[PDB]
Amino acid sequence: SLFSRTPKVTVFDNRGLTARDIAYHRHPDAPEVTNERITPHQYDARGFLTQSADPRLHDAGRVNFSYLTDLAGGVLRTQGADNGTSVSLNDVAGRPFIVVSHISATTEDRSLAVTRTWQYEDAALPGRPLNVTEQISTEVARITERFVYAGNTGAEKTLNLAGLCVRHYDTAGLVQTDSIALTGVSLSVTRRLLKDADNPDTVADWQGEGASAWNDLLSGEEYVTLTTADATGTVLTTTDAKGNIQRVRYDVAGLLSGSWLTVRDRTEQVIVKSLTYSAAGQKQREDHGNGVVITYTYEAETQRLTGIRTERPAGHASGAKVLQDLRYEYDPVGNVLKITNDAEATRFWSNQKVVPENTYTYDSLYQLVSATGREMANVGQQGSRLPSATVPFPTDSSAYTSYTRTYTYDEASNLTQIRHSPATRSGYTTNITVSNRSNRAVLSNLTENAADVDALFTAGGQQTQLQPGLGLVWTARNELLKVTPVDDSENYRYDGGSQRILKVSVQKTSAQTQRALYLPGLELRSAKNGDTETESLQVITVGEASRAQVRMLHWESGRPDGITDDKVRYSYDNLTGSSVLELDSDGKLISMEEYYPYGGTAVWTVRSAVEANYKTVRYSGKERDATGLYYYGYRYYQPWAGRWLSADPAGSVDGLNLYRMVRNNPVAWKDNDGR
Ligand SMILES: [Ca+2]
Ligand SMILES: [Cl-]
Ligand SMILES: [Cl-]
């Protein structure tokens, strides 16, 4: 009835090119009404795409993208509503030669334009890249990257280095590759940072006649990551920069069967004792170092994840208990209709039979239009801040009250309203104002007028204000550089591939400071109370960033009382990889967290006060910063707004809307990296 006669339709021109994509929108609220949505695409004489537009902007006679191509189809220019105008040219060898971006159309505002260029080896060499250059506006060009290659001396061959880049100087400093396997895996890499790398004023500029000069712009400290690998070129062990060793083992089918951690100067301990798999190679039964067992359950027909059961089993020293018994009910195409948890200790849902347990409804476009859950009664209205930690664990259904969210979407799939309706309290509404000529959008408190929305973004689609009186600065490569209030700042540094290597937070009244350095399987965290160290911390992280991760906290200095050194924190995730429970090495609950569909926190409780401040990874297995943003990798996310802080750097690959979050269906799908 709701989904009847609502196909996806592809309309061709007379050359078999897609002139229109047609979709059929229907809300369950109004099942009588069906809104036809036409996405037109134009092609030129050759048959290359020239224009695309979403239904909302076509309706208003405007366009989302214009493309200008060379005669082979290579796109020399893109004018985007969301991400501005950019010009591109590859050389005859197919390599990047020049890209000019940060340009706005009215002819063309070129004044803030970034020009990125490449320099290769001369024609008598193979043509490997030598440097990348970036020139902004009227400023002098800066050399942002350099590459140095190995020859093929006997020593180099002995390290499998011949002709490969051994020194890559990037936006954060140097990455040095000292050894490679027969199988091609890097066995020893070494990172050095720029001098004065905590200051967002310092940019990479690799000026100088040779490596002796470039190295003089680097800090002294070396962070060496070592690796061991099997005959298939698959990782067996990793030694981090502070000497902590992670080890894994593979079963007869090549799947992970066990893992261990050897903290520097300790003995090896079991992190994953055993791990079995279904016929499809998906996790079946997982046994942790803390004796906790995870049992995964799959629909036999569709292979969809039906159950996640976490428990301390029979004969466990801390006593048997089912900590989680998640069950999922899908509609035919695999949207999540219902989530139940019978292990829930409070027994909250069988007490409150007015609103049902995590029920979800969708429109014909599989956008989430309604959701129900529980929040802690005390949370109050959602903003950027995390709720206060409830300590100790609540012990009764009074602690949590039910809620019902309702979501409203425009013709271009912008999330314009999150309406919150609790059981017995005053509800609130978050309104998001969409631009009249783009998918740029901000909260109503920033503006309620469509025509002023694009002025809160740079040409490239980067948001300049996070909240009222909090300002945002972006790098030449559209990465978040700095959050500044208009007196607590935060700033960031990235490597060559836009992956965050550094985060520094500063509060000046005396100036208090915290620093996070992100390395392979290791975060070196510190703090100073005015050039005097209060805290020094290794977060050893075991596993992969898209799976239920295990963290080990080792203090070099400044350990708070109430935390035993080298305490392991096991994380336990839901369908979408959000960190929901933490257990300790006895299998006992440390914390529990639950989420509103789009990633705001609705429950946050911890057994102690001091333990609450050491869980960074939360929604989608990603770090929530003190700003309230989630760092995904290539972009930062706003859980209160249910949308990205900047335009998709991959363009229209995932859809025309460059700010939309996981096709507006955050309960099933999960954005891996923000690209
Ligand atoms: Ca349909
Ligand atoms: Cl417990
Ligand atoms: Cl939400």
GROMACS .gro file of N, CA and C in nm, residues 107 134 198 230-231 246 249 254 257 319 333 413 442 472 506-507 512 523 545 584 620 631 637 670:
model
   72
  107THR      N    1   3.112   3.703  -1.304
  107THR     CA    2   3.133   3.575  -1.371
  107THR      C    3   3.190   3.472  -1.273
  134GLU      N    4   5.120   2.415  -0.362
  134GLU     CA    5   4.993   2.479  -0.336
  134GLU      C    6   5.014   2.630  -0.323
  198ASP      N    7   5.209   2.173   1.693
  198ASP     CA    8   5.085   2.201   1.767
  198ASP      C    9   5.020   2.335   1.730
  230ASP      N   10   5.272  -1.264   0.722
  230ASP     CA   11   5.279  -1.404   0.682
  230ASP      C   12   5.309  -1.418   0.532
  231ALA      N   13   5.318  -1.542   0.484
  231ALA     CA   14   5.349  -1.569   0.343
  231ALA      C   15   5.249  -1.510   0.242
  246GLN      N   16   5.095  -0.584   1.924
  246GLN     CA   17   4.970  -0.655   1.891
  246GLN      C   18   4.997  -0.773   1.800
  249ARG      N   19   4.639  -1.424   1.482
  249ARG     CA   20   4.650  -1.559   1.427
  249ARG      C   21   4.533  -1.584   1.333
  254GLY      N   22   4.216  -1.866   0.651
  254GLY     CA   23   4.270  -1.729   0.645
  254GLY      C   24   4.194  -1.620   0.721
  257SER      N   25   4.146  -1.580   1.396
  257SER     CA   26   4.101  -1.677   1.499
  257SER      C   27   4.139  -1.638   1.642
  319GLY      N   28   3.032  -1.423   3.762
  319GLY     CA   29   2.895  -1.471   3.768
  319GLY      C   30   2.819  -1.447   3.639
  333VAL      N   31   1.320  -0.520   0.195
  333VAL     CA   32   1.446  -0.467   0.138
  333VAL      C   33   1.560  -0.447   0.238
  413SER      N   34   1.602   1.565  -0.038
  413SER     CA   35   1.649   1.482   0.073
  413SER      C   36   1.735   1.555   0.178
  442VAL      N   37   2.177   2.507   0.762
  442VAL     CA   38   2.218   2.532   0.901
  442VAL      C   39   2.096   2.536   0.993
  472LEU      N   40   3.480   2.852   1.228
  472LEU     CA   41   3.551   2.738   1.167
  472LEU      C   42   3.647   2.787   1.059
  506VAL      N   43   4.290   2.401   2.352
  506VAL     CA   44   4.349   2.506   2.437
  506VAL      C   45   4.238   2.587   2.504
  507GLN      N   46   4.249   2.608   2.636
  507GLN     CA   47   4.160   2.698   2.712
  507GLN      C   48   4.245   2.800   2.789
  512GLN      N   49   4.553   2.626   2.981
  512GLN     CA   50   4.547   2.479   2.997
  512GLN      C   51   4.536   2.413   2.858
  523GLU      N   52   4.738   0.608   2.042
  523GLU     CA   53   4.714   0.753   2.060
  523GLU      C   54   4.796   0.800   2.180
  545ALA      N   55   3.926  -0.013   1.280
  545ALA     CA   56   3.838   0.102   1.310
  545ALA      C   57   3.690   0.086   1.268
  584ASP      N   58   3.516  -0.442   3.152
  584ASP     CA   59   3.655  -0.443   3.200
  584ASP      C   60   3.714  -0.583   3.186
  620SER      N   61   2.902   0.517   1.554
  620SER     CA   62   2.968   0.457   1.436
  620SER      C   63   3.114   0.417   1.455
  631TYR      N   64   3.456   1.294   1.417
  631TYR     CA   65   3.556   1.285   1.313
  631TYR      C   66   3.550   1.145   1.247
  637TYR      N   67   3.117   1.531   1.126
  637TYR     CA   68   2.972   1.513   1.123
  637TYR      C   69   2.903   1.585   1.241
  670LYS      N   70   2.579   0.271   0.755
  670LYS     CA   71   2.687   0.331   0.834
  670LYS      C   72   2.791   0.390   0.738
   0.00000   0.00000   0.00000
